[PDB]
Every structure is written in C-alpha cells, then in structure tokens.
Amino acid sequence: SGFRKMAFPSGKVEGCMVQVTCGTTTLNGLWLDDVVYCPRHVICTSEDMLNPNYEDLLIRKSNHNFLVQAGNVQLRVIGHSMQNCVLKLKVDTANPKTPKYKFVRIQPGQTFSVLACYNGSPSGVYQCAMRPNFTIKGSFLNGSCGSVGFNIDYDCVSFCYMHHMELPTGVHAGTDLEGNFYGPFVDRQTAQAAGTDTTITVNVLAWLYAAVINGDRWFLNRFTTTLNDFNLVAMKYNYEPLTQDHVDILGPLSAQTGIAVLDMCASLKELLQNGMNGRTILGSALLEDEFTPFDVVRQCSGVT
Amino acid sequence: SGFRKMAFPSGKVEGCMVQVTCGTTTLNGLWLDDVVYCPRHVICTSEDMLNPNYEDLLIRKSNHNFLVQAGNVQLRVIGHSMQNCVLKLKVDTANPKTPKYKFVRIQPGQTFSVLACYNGSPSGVYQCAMRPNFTIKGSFLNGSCGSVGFNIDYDCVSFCYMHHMELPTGVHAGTDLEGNFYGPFVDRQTAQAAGTDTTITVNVLAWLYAAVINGDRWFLNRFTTTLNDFNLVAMKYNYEPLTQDHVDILGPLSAQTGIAVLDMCASLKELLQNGMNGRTILGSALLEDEFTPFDVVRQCSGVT
Ligand SMILES: O=C(Nc1cncc2ccccc12)[C@@H]1CCNc2ccc(Cl)cc21
Ligand SMILES: O=C(Nc1cncc2ccccc12)[C@@H]1CCNc2ccc(Cl)cc21
C-alpha cells in the first residue's frame, strides 16, 4: 500500500540523451538509431526568438555547425532536416543504447514521465500530465530544452513530449517527437497565454479509487448521482465533463473496490461542494488529477 | 521555473537490480561488485515471520538454495552471510554495471529516491523522506522487498535504504545497506506501531523558499520572529524544533531570495495559525516537507 506520484524508471531514456550546440545555444537532444532529435530553436540567438524565420535561419547552418556530444565523445553529423519544430540530425553512428521505441502524440489528461536534462546530462525524473489547455506543469530551467516526456510499456519507450518553452506564467509548452506543438503554442518569444486549466475529472476519480484501495475511505458517502447531474457540478468547478467512455475506463477500479462509478461521482460532487474540511486524501489536501485510471491500476498491481 | 517532487535518474540503480528466490519467497536484491544484498527475511515462509530465529533458519540454507537471477541469466552463489537484517550473497561474477557507490545511513528529514522493483524488475521511481519517526511513506506492494533508496552525487550512488516491511498503518520500514533498521522496527510479523509523524520544519522552510523563487509570494507577511518564539508555535503543530544549524543550512536560500530565515519562520508561523484559506503554494494545499534545502538549491540550479 501507499500511493506516490511515481515516474517510470528512466534508464532507457538516459542512454539516449545527448548535448546539441549550435553556435552559442546549447540544449538537449534525443539520440535514437542514427538520428538526434532536438528543438529547432537551437539555431536561434535570444534576439532571433522575437520573430524567427526558421527556414531562413537554417539556410546559414551546415552539418558541421551542429555539435552533438554523447557523454564526452563527439558524434559526426552527416545530415540535417527540419520537421515542424524539431531538427533531425543524422549522425554516422547508431545509438548502441537505443531502446525499442515509438513516437506517440498524447491526448490531454494523459500522464507521462519527464527526464529533465541539462547539457545532455540527466538531472531528475518526475511525473506530470498533458493539461486540458495543452501545457504541462513541469520543472524546467534554461538549458532544459530538448528534455523528453515518455511512457514505458515493458521494454518499449513511447516518447510523447519534447520540451521547448516556458510561458510567462511558469507553465511549459512543447512538441510531440514529430515537432508538432501540443496546443496553440509557437516557438517564438511572444505573448502566448495559456487557456483555462481545467481539472481532469476521470483522473481525480481514479485517484479517489486509489485512496479507497489504500484505506482512505472517509469521503465515501451514502449518495449516487447521474452523469448529467454530476457534470452540472463539474462544469461549475472547471472540471472536464465526464463521459460514458470515462466511466468505462474506470470499470476495473470500480470492480476492485465494489464502488459503482456514479457513486464515486457523488462522493466527488460532495467534495467539490463541501471542500475537504481540513482533511487529507492520500496525504493531499487537494483533489489530485495527474494519475490516470491506467496509472492507478499499474501502481496498485506492480507492472514492471 | 516550476517545482516538482523530482527523483534522481534511476538508470545506475536499475543496472543493479536482481531477483533473489529462497524456497518459495521471491524478493529483490542489489548487485554491487560480486555481492548481492537482500532482506534476510527471504529465508522465511509467512509462518516463520511470526517469531523467526534467523540464525537457526539460515543453518538450513546453503549457497544453492539462494537463486539469483539478473535479467534472465542465473548468477552462481559461492558464499552467503548475514549482516544484521540483510543477506550478502557472494556471486562468482562482478556486476559489470556496478556504478561508483557508497553505503550511507541517513538522518530523519533527509530525502532520497526509491526505485520500486518486483521480481528484480523496476516498476517506478519516486522521491520520499526518512520521517522523524523512522518510517517512510512509500508505495510498495508484496514482492517489493529489497527495493532500494538512494541519492546520486554526479556519478556516485549513495545507497541509504533497503525496503523490508509495511506496518499495519500503511507506512514502510527498512534498513540501511548494512542491515540496520531505521528506527525501532524489527523484521518480525508483530505489533509494531509508528511514533508521532512530526513535520520536518527545515524542509517546509526550504519549500517556502522554493515557492518564493518560483513566484508564489502571497504568504509573505510583514512579520519576523525568534527561534524560541517560532519553536513555541512549531511544537504546538507537531513540527520539529528549528535549530541554528537549520538556519545555517537555509542560508543560501535566504541569500537568493533576500528573505531572512526568521522572516520566513514568521510567514510559516502565520500559515500554521491561520491555515491556507483555500489557497495553494506550488500547487499544494498543505505545507510540503519532503524537499531538503539541498534539494531546493539542486532543483532551482539544475545539478546533473
Ligand atoms: O523558453 C525557453 N526556455 C526555457 C524552457 N523551460 C524553462 C525555462 C526556464 C528559464 C528560462 C528559460 C526556459 C526559451 C528561451 C526563452 N524564450 C523562448 C521562446 C520560445 C521558445 Cl520555443 C523557447 C524559448
Ligand atoms: O511487510 C512485508 N512485505 C511488504 C512490504 N511492503 C509492502 C507490502 C504490501 C503488501 C504486502 C506486503 C508488503 C513482509 C510480508 C508481510 N509481513 C512481514 C513482516 C516482517 C517483514 Cl520484515 C516483512 C514482511
């Protein structure tokens, strides 16, 4: 028992981190097979970021201007291309530590682990979620660009995020490994404000199920509700609307605890309306929404 | 910016995890050089746990009764010894992935990363702290025994914890890598209740400094206090007494923000007395105490 914000073991991804320098900009790259992936803004100076024309800027760059260093050995760059907001640097050597991998574009509400890196070296690993407003609440400093987000299924690493920027609000924006930003963000030093950060209802319910499994049962009440009644309350509290798809996905947690999904919705509805009254759930004084139903089942069953 | 409960990259420790089976009990072991470390309760059946005499039980075990499997290849056991509550299994092969390492015994209030494992395979990584009552609030299921806690300083892994048991309250107890339990716990299936879980004051102040650095400044007030006045309030709220050593350790955070330590104590004192009033600090509705001053400086500077 016990419930923690757990990240995937990062070893498979640490073996892929390299440093990419172009001129005076140094950031991280991801080395898979003979290709190094990195944010295209590695070719920019801070002055270029105001209004960069990446195609024009890239014309003044050759293979030898991209310095790729893995550990402490230099990789030879034999090709470069821009795909959306990422640069793919073809190196002459395949990464011998390349794990089995996929590039996936995740949906908001989905969680992933981030291995924060600086100068191609890992500093830490943490778990976060793609927010409904397509930002992530990460922990990134200058130089962290190119750090990646991923999930692991047994031996396959599904890369889903590459870090590109921090918005003035301290939230983070980035792309999938094809270079497409999550949300409406653009890799430019301009006024970009995040939209409403709504709460991921299905995740909060999964975490309520995790609390029941781990012994925290005080919030269970004698009520039930309907999807429509629950959603009237959820909209008022800037919670995402709950769908039958979400109820279906919560099925295994409902089966394990014997608490019907709509009964858990009524419990959540009362927690929204009455607050916690100074109490905690799984050591938290707020409703946690960065654990998916899959994460709860995984953590409570011990998938390796 | 952004502040997350960050764990160390786990790769160096993943390369050390093996599976140890003795009879019908399977748990995890740590393979460093030619020695595999594991909880001595691997030699027990659940019936033995009621009142085990480990010396007597170990007499009926030979080298060939300890099955050590690294990945999917069997290691040959050429010696075994009991040191306190751990077994050291001498294997004929040194772990080729052994990182630079130390065995350290940590003090309460110190934080570390745990790589939770099942059948010698990593499932996840999370950060936690040695509580003042010598328990840890982990996330461990049956089979997780032998999972380790560690810190990394550049390339050196300081192993500090080996997981042994879960108390009836859902908190966890374990040993340092010399087999000595943290706290008064014994590896026996008996009535062991944890003591008062006090809050690590120095860590809460470090996290208040992290919040100021990351923009959350609403809790800063116009007051100051003294160590004695602050400690009168801290005792009332089951917070550890703050010492001049703690003030000294908070010095770099005080310098970075320009907020004197005793002024931050007055802010904390008001937060204890008045509560949060429905507000949050670094996305939390409670005062977080599992970040040391070293962790705050590390995360805010990007040590790799
Ligand atoms: O955001 C960026 N980098 C960072 C990323 N994460 C956390 C940071 C913390 C502190 C300083 C920088 C950080 C970069 C540089 C600033 N301007 C800018 C504009 C557009 C793009 Cl695509 C990238 C950037
Ligand atoms: O605590 C133990 N294991 C576990 C450890 N962590 C989380 C667990 C969750 C669920 C089931 C077991 C868990 C073991 C078995 C039970 N009794 C026992 C008594 C003494 C000692 Cl030293 C070990 C043990």
Swiss-Prot record, chains A, B:
- Swiss-Prot/TrEMBL puts the cross-link Glycyl lysine isopeptide (Lys-Gly) (interchain with G-Cter in ubiquitin) at K5, K90
Outcome reported for the amino acid change (mutating N142A): Does not affect ability to cleave and inactivate human TRMT1
Domain (Peptidase C30): residue spans on this chain: 1-304
Q: Topological domains (Cytoplasmic): residue ranges?
A: 1-304
Give the reactions, separated by semicolons, that this protein catalyses. Answer: TSAVLQ-|-SGFRK-NH2 and SGVTFQ-|-GKFKK the two peptides corresponding to the two self-cleavage sites of the SARS 3C-like proteinase are the two most reactive peptide substrates. The enzyme exhibits a strong preference for substrates containing Gln at P1 position and Leu at P2 position
What is known about regulation of its activity? Inhibited by pyridone-containing alpha-ketoamides compounds 13a and 13b. In turn, alpha-ketoamide 13b (tert-butyl (1-((S)-1-(((S)-4-(benzylamino)-3,4-dioxo-1-((S)-2-oxopyrrolidin-3-yl)butan-2-yl)amino)-3-cyclopropyl-1-oxopropan-2-yl)-2-oxo-1,2-dihydropyridin-3-yl)carbamate) inhibits SARS-CoV-2 replication in human lung cells. Inhibited ex vivo by michael acceptor inhibitor N3. Inhibited ex vivo by compound 11a and 11b.
Active site per database record: H41 (for 3cl-pro activity), C145 (nucleophile)
Can you say where in the cell this protein is located? Host cytoplasm; Host Golgi apparatus; Host nucleus
Q: What does this protein do?
A: Cleaves the C-terminus of replicase polyprotein at 11 sites. Recognizes substrates containing the core sequence [ILMVF]-Q-|-[SGACN]. Cleaves and inactivates human TRMT1, preventing tRNA guanine(26)-dimethylation of tRNAs. May cleave human NLRP1 in lung epithelial cells, thereby activating the NLRP1 inflammasome pathway. May cleave human GSDMD, triggering alternative GSDME-mediated epithelial cell death upon activation of the NLRP1 inflammasome, which may enhance the release interleukins 1B, 6, 16 and 18. Also able to bind an ADP-ribose-1''-phosphate (ADRP).
Self-association or partners: how does it assemble? 3CL-PRO exists as monomer and homodimer. Only the homodimer shows catalytic activity. Interacts with host FBXO22; this interaction promotes the proteasomal degradation of nsp5.
What is the protein name stated in its UniProt record? 3C-like proteinase nsp5
| Chain's gene name | rep
